[PDB]
């Protein structure tokens, strides 16, 4: 079961998330006194990454999902039987992937040999000038409600900055739900 | 023993049903408070389905009658004798039909042996906000040699072309002359 | 073609009735004899009496049904906004108007004027029945009533549906029930 | 761009008051009615009451967001000094001006087309008895940071809004952020 530890390391490694409000058009949008994002199927998620001071050239960024109810959390997060069937659409990424990267055409996807969970990882690229932050835009391709999937679970992604030898070097995690209303979902739940 | 249990699954999958009234003339009529139609034997008995975001096309909708009571769950619904004694598509032993469907399907469940009627799915028309399907229950809830007065519920399952299961609903269901009647008499307890 | 609201008090001597509740700032339901026409709130109980002269047959059933005012909306059906059709598990999302606390309720959607009803068993009672009516759309949502005025037919059916008696009144819906009726009465 | 700070009570009769604090040298908020002006301390409670004729739907929201007064800085972004804003910050932006305190349900928006900041809240209806609801403010920068407002007046425009989003009603009133309130707007009064 792997580790959701919270762990600046040694590079001041934090998240962020864009402050989007809870208006009942916006496609995301980050609770912090849930520490939960609320974002839509196969939509833009997009979650910042601060540090303290630039990694190596090499490091790299794991994304991993992981159910949050300890008698789930043995269970490999991944897509539902329907959506996990092949489309046109899938591109760069394993059709049974819960977590894709949008954007990224040096994106890299994991079945673990031994654990078998899935992951996505990317280069490290630090914030363009005039930034103090580099974003990566996610996309959960199954909805919180599917039938065979998570099925009404919820789960957990794990961040994790790793050096080009997989050491880690900072890990932060956060919820998500995937559903058609993020605004309204946030705005009920912190209610 | 095929599933009951509500899914709205990642579609949002509900069901829905005409606000008809009870009046004499009404050939069918749906209580909320018992989640439970009323129809005549053969007459058109429509479902809304509803959904918050639309299936893919080869998406299929499946109905399925169970006895409602745990002591005749496992027993097979299925018309009586005197009724399977058709409109050429619809095997006669099985109680629900779809009328008006070139495209249905019927099912014999080879390891279970229970009945099931299927229909490809179709979004709702241009102005609509639900899909309809008529059904046809071609037994009375007292024929004899069939439901013979046990309660019976419907299970509408939608699936994707592949048989994975989306979403799942249900409701009680009556077949008798009189569903105004008979509605309002039951809503009485 | 639009359904009838003249009144009838036919065999039974049908009436409707009010609280006599005044116009203090707290009251969330007044009606006006002068005006004939009940102030209430959004989703907030509004009280009915029936009134009768000799008591109903079993099987006798009290319809609601709102209808424009105004000759020039008269045949448009009256239905919540959009808005806030966007509840209790068994009234329809787009019905105005819903009885509260009675589990025998019935909606109707006419399959061919398209217009809304709620019909409840009468049930004899005190010297009045009271059903508890509730309006779930302000009278100015816009998109819905928006800004025009409605009327409440009030109906005593048999059970098998011939009439037995007719009533209406008024409503507005908004925030303040008592100084709307009592700005309304001053003009 | 500019938001509105025209005043609109609307349906509902919206106002605000404030308390009758005074200017006694230990005061920490306190507000001229002759100026509508309120003098406050840095990251100290500022109480605002909002009054109303009638009470609003279920789901209003109450918004505030601050604006530089003066016609040549309107298009400026209100927000907080560099020196301030370095990351106590809870649930709220960093770089946020306004911060709203004692409500688990705050909600905060950069928004995404003007990037102005603002903080809201549910509207909740005073208690049987009361006639008014206060909303508690702090504001985190002083008027004169450097870097920041730098010594421009600013005015804080409160918004009632329904769950939707559509405007009920608007008012507004200059904010001075500096230690000694009861000084300061004794001193101002004198000319
Ligand atoms: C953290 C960074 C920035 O400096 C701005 C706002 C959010 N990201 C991208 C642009
Ligand atoms: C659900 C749909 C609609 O939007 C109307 C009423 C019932 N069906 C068909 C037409
Ligand atoms: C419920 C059924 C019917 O449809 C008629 C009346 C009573 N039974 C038998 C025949
Ligand atoms: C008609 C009945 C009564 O007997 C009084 C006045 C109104 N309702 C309830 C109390
Ligand atoms: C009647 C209605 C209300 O409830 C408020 C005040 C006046 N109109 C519009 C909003
Ligand atoms: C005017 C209205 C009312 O009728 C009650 C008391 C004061 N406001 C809000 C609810
Ligand atoms: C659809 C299926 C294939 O045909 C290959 C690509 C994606 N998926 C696994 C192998
Ligand atoms: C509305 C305001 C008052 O009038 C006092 C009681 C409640 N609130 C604070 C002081
Ligand atoms: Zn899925
Ligand atoms: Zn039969
Ligand atoms: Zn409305
Ligand atoms: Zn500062």
């Not at 839509?40 to 960024?61: E, I, M, N, Y």
């Not at 794991?62 to 159910?67: C, D, L, P, Q, S």
């Amino acid at each position: 079961v792997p580790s959701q530890k919270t762990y600046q390391g040694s590079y001041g490694f934090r998240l962020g998330f864009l402050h989007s409000g809870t208006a009942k058009s916006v496609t995301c949008t980050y609770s912090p006194a849930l520490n939960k994002m609320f974002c839509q199927l196969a939509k833009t998620c997009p979650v910042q990454l601060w540090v303290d001071s630039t990694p190596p050239p090499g490091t790299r960024v794991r994304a991993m999902a992981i159910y949050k109810q300890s008698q789930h959390m043995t269970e490999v997060v991944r897509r539902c039987p329907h959506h996990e069937r092949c489309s046109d659409s899938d591109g760069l990424a394993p059709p049974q992937h819960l977590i894709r990267v949008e954007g990224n055409l040096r994106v890299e996807y994991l079945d673990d040999r031994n654990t078998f969970r899935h992951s996505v990882v990317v280069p490290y690229e630090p914030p363009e000038v005039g930034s103090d932050c580099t974003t990566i835009h996610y996309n959960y391709m199954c909805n919180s409600s599917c039938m065979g999937g998570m099925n009404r679970r919820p789960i957990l992604t794990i961040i994790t900055l790793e050096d080009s030898s997989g050491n880690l070097l900072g890990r932060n995690s956060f919820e998500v739900h995937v559903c058609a209303c993020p605004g309204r979902d946030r705005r009920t739940e912190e209610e």
